[PDB]
Amino acid sequence: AIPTMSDVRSFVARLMAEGDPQQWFPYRVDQILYWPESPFVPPIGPFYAPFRPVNFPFTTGSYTVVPDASRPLRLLPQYRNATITVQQADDAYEDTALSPLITTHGFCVTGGVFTSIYDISGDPTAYPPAQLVDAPNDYFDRERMARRDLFRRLRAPADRSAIKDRAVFDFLASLVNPTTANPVLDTSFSMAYLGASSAHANADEPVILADIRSGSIPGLPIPRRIVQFGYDVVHGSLLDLSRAVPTGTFGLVYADLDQVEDAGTDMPAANRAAIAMLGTALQMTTAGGVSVLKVNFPTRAFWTQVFNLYATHATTLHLVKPTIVNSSEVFLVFGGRQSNGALRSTTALQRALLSLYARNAAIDRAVTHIPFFGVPDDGTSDLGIDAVRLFDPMFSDAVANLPSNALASLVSRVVPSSIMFTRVPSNGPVSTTIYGKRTFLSNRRRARLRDVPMLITTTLVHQRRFTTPPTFTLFSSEAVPVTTLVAAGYNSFISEQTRNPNLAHLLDLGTGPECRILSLIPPTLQVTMSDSRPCAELMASFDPALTAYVQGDYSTAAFWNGIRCDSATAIFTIGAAAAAAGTDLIAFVQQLIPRIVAAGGTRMWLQLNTPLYEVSSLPDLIEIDLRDHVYRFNGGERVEPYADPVPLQQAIAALLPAAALSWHTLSPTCDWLPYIIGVGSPLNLSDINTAISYSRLTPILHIDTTTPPLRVNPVPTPLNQQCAIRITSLDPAAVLSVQHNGVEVIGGTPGNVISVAG
Amino acid sequence: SLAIVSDRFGQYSFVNEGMRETFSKALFDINMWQPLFQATKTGCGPIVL
Numbered sequence: 132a133i134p135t136m137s138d139v140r141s142f143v144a145r146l147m148a149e150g151d152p153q154q155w156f157p158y159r160v161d162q163i164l165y166w167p168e169s170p171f172v173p174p175i176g177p178f179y180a181p182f183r184p185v186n187f188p189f190t191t192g193s194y195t196v197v198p199d200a201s202r203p204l205r206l207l208p209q210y211r212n213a214t215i216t217v218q219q220a221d222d223a224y225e226d227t228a229l230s231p232l233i234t235t236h237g238f239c240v241t242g243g244v245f246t247s248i249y250d251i252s253g254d255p256t257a258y259p260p261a262q263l264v265d266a267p268n269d270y271f272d273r274e275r276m277a278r279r280d281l282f283r284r285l286r287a288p289a290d291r292s293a294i295k296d297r298a299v300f301d302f303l304a305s306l307v308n309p310t311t312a313n314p315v316l317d318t319s320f321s322m323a324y325l326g327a328s329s330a331h332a333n334a335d336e337p338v339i340l341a342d343i344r345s346g347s348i349p350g351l352p353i354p355r356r357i358v359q360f361g362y363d364v365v366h367g368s369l370l371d372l373s374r375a376v377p378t379g380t381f382g383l384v385y386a387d388l389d390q391v392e393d394a395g396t397d398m399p400a401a402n403r404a405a406i407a408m409l410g411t412a413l414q415m416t417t418a419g420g421v422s423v424l425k426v427n428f429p430t431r432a433f434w435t436q437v438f439n440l441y442a443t444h445a446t447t448l449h450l451v452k453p454t455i456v457n458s459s460e461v462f463l464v465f466g467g468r469q470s471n472g473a474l475r476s477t478t479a480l481q482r483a484l485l486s487l488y489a490r491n492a493a494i495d496r497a498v499t500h501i502p503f504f505g506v507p508d509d510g511t512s513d514l515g516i517d518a519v520r521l522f523d524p525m526f527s528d529a530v531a532n533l534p535s536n537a538l539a540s541l542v543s544r545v546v547p548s549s550i551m552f553t554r555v556p557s558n559g560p561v562s563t564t565i566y567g568k569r570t571f572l573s574n575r576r577r578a579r580l581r582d583v584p585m586l587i588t589t590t591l592v593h594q595r596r597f598t599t600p601p602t603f604t605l606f607s608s609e610a611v612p613v614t615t616l617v618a619a620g621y622n623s624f625i626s627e628q629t630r631n632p633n634l635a636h637l638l639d640l641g642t643g644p645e646c647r648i649l650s651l652i653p654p655t656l657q658v659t660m661s662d663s664r665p666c667a668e669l670m671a672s673f674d675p676a677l678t679a680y681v682q683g684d685y686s687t688a689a690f691w692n693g694i695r696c697d698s699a700t701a702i703f704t705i706g707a708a709a710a711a712a713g714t715d716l717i718a719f720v721q722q723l724i725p726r727i728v729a730a731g732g733t734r735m736w737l738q739l740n741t742p743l744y745e746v747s748s749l750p751d752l753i754e755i756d757l758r759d760h761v762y763r764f765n766g767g768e769r770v771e772p773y774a775d776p777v778p779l780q781q782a783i784a785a786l787l788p789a790a791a792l793s794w795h796t797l798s799p800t801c802d803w804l805p806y807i808i809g810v811g812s813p814l815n816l817s818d819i820n821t822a823i824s825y826s827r828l829t830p831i832l833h834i835d836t837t838t839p840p841l842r843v844n845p846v847p848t849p850l851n852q853q854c855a856i857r858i859t860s861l862d863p864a865a866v867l868s869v870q871h872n873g874v875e876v877i878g879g880t881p882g883n884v885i886s887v888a889g
Numbered sequence: 890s891l892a893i894v895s896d897r898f899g900q901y902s903f904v905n906e907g908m909r910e911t912f913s914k915a916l917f918d919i920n921m922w923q924p925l926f927q928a929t930k931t932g933c934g935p936i937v938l
Contacts, residue, residue: 212932530934587930 141558145523154181195595199556203601206552206565208542209590209668213529214582215536223537224544227519229564231508234516237606239285239501240456241813245820246298249450249461249483254888255475260435262476266428267488270459271395278498282457285501285606289332295453296339299423299462302451304351306466315421315466316383319355323379323415325372325408326387326425327361336365356381362389373407384412384422402433409441416468424463434476437463442474450480452487454816457494461487478886485874486799493801497808502605514605514811517544518566524554526563526588535585541565543583546573547645547669548810552591553598566601568811572650579654581673610815612752613766615807615822620702620738620831622803623795625651627734627833629697637698637734640685640705644668648700649678659696661685686712691726698734699727702831706740709772716760716774717782724786735834740773743794743827752821753828762828773828780843791835792843798823800872851889913938 134142156162163171165180166189269275288294306315322343330337337359346353358381359367370376372386386408390401405426412422426433442448446467452460502512509515519541525534542550544567551566628635635656639648642662646669652658657677662670663684671680685691686708709719716739727735740762748755754763755773762771783792797803807814844856867879878884894900916936919926926933 211930213934529932 137558141561144559145561148523153185153187154183156181197594197596199597199599201599203551203566204553204594204598206550207590207668208547208550208586210584210672211529211587212672213535213585214672215532215539215585216582217580220536220540220543220583223533224517224519224540226533227521227537229518229520230516232516232518232603234502234506234508235602235604235606236285236502236504237604238287238813239282239498239606239808240815241286241609242815242817243286243288243455244294245454245816246302247452247454247483247487248302249448249452250477250479251447251449252477252479252888254479255477258476258478258481260431260438260476263431263434263481264485265431267492274499275495277503278495279456279458281501281503282494282498284504286456288455290338291455292330292332293338293342294455297342298453299451299464300343300348300351302449303421303464304348314351316351318352320353321382321417322354322357323360323381323384323412324358324387325360325385325412326389327359327364327367328389329363329365354383372411373404374411376411378414380417381415382417382420384415384420385425386412386423387425388427390427398428398430401428402430402436405433406436406440409437413441413444413468418469420468421464421466422468424465425460426463427460429459429461438474438476441465442472444469444472445474446470446472448474448477448480450483457491457498459487459491478888481886482874489873490801493805497805501808512569513571513809515569516567516603516605517541517569518551518564518601518603521563521565522560524561524563526591528588529585532585535588536583538565539583539585541567542586543577543580544569544573546570546576546650547647548573551601553600554594554596555600556597562600564600566603568605570811571809575652575654576650579649579673579676581675584669584672606811606813609813610807610818612818612822612825615818616797616825616829617702618806619797619803619822619826620795621647621651622806623797623831624700624736625806626802628653628656635698636696638694638696638700640699640701642666642680644670646670659694661694691730695731697732698736699732700734700736702736702738703771703829705737706771706773710761710770716772717778720782721786733836733838735836736831737834738829738831739779740771740829741779741832742773742776743830744776746775747824749825749828752825777846788840788842790840791833791838792841793833793835795831795833796872797826797830853889909938 154162154164161174161177162181163169163177163179165184168189168191171177171179304314304316308314324337324340328337329335332338334341340357340359342348343354344357359365360370360372361367362369388405388408390404395401405424409424412424416422445465447465449464449466451462451464453462500513502514506512506515508517519537521534521537525531527534529535548570549566549568552563553566554561554563626632632653634653636658637652637656638659638661640661642648642660644662644664644666646660646662646666648658648660654676659679659681660671661681661683663682665682671678681694683690685694709716712719720737720739746755751765754765756763757775760773760775762769762773764771804814804819839860842856842858845854847855865879866881867877868875869877869879875884876886916938920935923933923935
């Protein structure tokens with residue numbers, strides 16, 4: 132309206148740049164467009180037009196009055212066929228980058244809440260220390276420590292101790308006994324809270340205590356008597372817990388080793404301390420009494436001393452890990468103190484040990500890859516921010532090059548994950564900052580490139596206004612259950628190439644428009660792509676590394692025909708496809724085998740919606756309908772066809788079994804979760820297990836052609852009794868390596884592993 | 890003694906007079922449809938051999 136000092140000075144600054152028009156003018160006349168859009172009356176002095184009708188585009192159109200958008204904007208990079216050389220791309224990036232800049236980390240995890248059980252069982256027969264597989268002999272490494280800090284950092288709850296105890300106390304209360312009608316503990320009971328702290332997390336005391344005292348334990352009510360014994364204590368006393376301290380008798384001994392020392396190199400001292408306060412906790416127990424032992428570093432030698440020195444006088448063993456952060460801190464929850472017992476190491480306890488350690492390890496390897504605190508952009512970090520800026524917007528077309536290429540470049544680096552553009556409200560050079568995040572994933576795709584398509588300039592030009600800058604952040608928001616589960620199938624793909632990530636001639640059955648498959652396949656791989664939907668955006672353009680696009684929908688009669696590969700990837704797709712067809716799943720599947728029978732194919736990755744075991748409905752997710760053997764998916768509405776396991780098995784059996792029969796074991800294993808972390812994604816631990824459940828109903832049935840039939844029979848005499856069957860075509864002296872992702876149950880001849888209940 | 894110029898990434902042989910002349914002509918075929926290429930957004934921009 133009335134132009135600001137600010138805006139005029141901006142506009143002028145802009146004007147006093149470079150670049151020249153087409154329709155010049157003589158100074159004797161005014162020259163008003165020969166293409167008669169202009170409303171040119173008969174003016175006194177102006178003749179008309181420029182005298183010289185040349186050639187250039189024009190058109191009519193009004194301006195969309197769009198307000199200043201106080202939000203960062205996303206960009207779909209629709210591509211145009213003018214394909215810059217890698218070096219130039221890179222170069223131009225270098226030229227326009229606003230990067231390096233100090234990356235707001237955010238969070239690794241948004242919700243670090245889980246309870247990992249360890250338990251008693253009537254299963255220990257001959258399992259001594261000598262059975263127990265010793266801790267990672269490597270656990271104190273530079274990199275490994277950084278990892279723990281990194282993760283810890285990138286999780287801010289502050290109510291760590293709270294969640295902790297509330298969980299344990301729920302667990303401990305859960306020991307409800309028939310014979311008495313009551314739990315282990317009644318009302319107005321006893322706590323020996325030892326290893327106590329001034330917990331400055333809004334309370335200035337242990338957050339738990341106040342709640343317990345007041346009645347904040349589901350099911351069990353109040354204690355009487357609680358102590359705050361320690362070192363950094365406010366309501367209690369200064370005692371050295373480990374040594375011989377004033378013998379007072381308590382029912383619930385909560386021992387807490389705040390392991391405060393620099394010199395972690397002394398493992399002996401670490402265990403001898405634990406031993407000492409284990410003693411003291413026994414000295415402390417009233418007749419029958421329970422005790423909790425928060426121990427940091429577990430080991431064989433510890434478990435040893437427990438067994439040997441204590442078990443005698445304890446009836447029951449429980450243990451837990453509050454899974455907040457990634458660390459080795461177990462809670463030894465023992466029951467029935469100062470009484471006779473003949474406790475021994477349990478199969479349960481073993482499995483749980485292994486699972487824990489493995490969780491730790493898997494997450495460890497991932498996290499180690501994440502950028503540290505106060506890291507400038509080095510190019511190298513698995514994650515980081517590469518943003519380029521456009522100094523006074525020269526979007527234009529292909530011919531412009533330097534803008535378009537830098538753009539392009541940024542898009543090659545990022546590969547459909549992150550992609551922002553914003554024309555910043557600013558007075559002077561009007562910056563149109565373009566922002567991205569590098570990933571290991573994006574790199575893989577970049578590597579497969581020949582060249583970089585300068586995307587269609589027009590998609591950008593559509594935004595005629597002012598858009599505010601992004602805040603700049605590494606991490607995002609949260610982990611959607613559904614997306615976790617898809618990512619887990621994807622991980623599985625990646626890591627099962629041929630003969631252990633061994634280069635792969637495959638197909639994509641149902642190539643999503645974005646082609647994420649390419650980002651999962653190593654750049655060397657030789658791929659077929661059935662993109663049923665008409666895809667244009669970064670689709671086939673660069674054929675070199677065999678990107679064999681076969682448009683159209685395979686499900687139809689005759690079309691599959693032409694396709695050769697050795698891995699046919701179908702996750703979810705098949706589901707949808709059978710619904711489309713309105714057919715007996717049996718029949719459809721069946722027809723699909725002969726199909727693929729005629730092709731040069733090995734890995735059939737058939738992820739039908741089928742249960743692995745006993746059907747449980749998953750509300751607000753998966754609802755199961757049998758009458759028409761379909762999932763009614765809760766996210767709005769998604770009709771996903773489902774099959775029971777036995778009719779499937781029944782159909783396979785009836786046909787033939789001439790193939791390898793493998794299921795993708797996602798539900799315990801941490802390994803696929805690094806994938807998730809990898810794409811700048813605030814994990815959730817409760818969202819993890821939910822997915823975990825859901826997998827069991829949506830697994831990838833991996834069926835391999837040219838292989839020995841696998842023989843599964845689990846139907847006769849189940850009932851905690853026994854199945855019968857034969858494993859064929861094997862050497863007279865066989866060493867029967869049967870395992871559960873390392874978890875060696877069944878060794879064959881190596882029977883020293885018989886860990887099964889049964 | 891002679892060593893060939895930079896085959897490496899550039900400086901090669903004396904160009905075929907005929908091949909230049911020919912090739913430029915070929916480019917002109919495409920040029921015959923320039924307005925259409927352009928409209929199709931199909932990298933139209935006349936090469937300039």
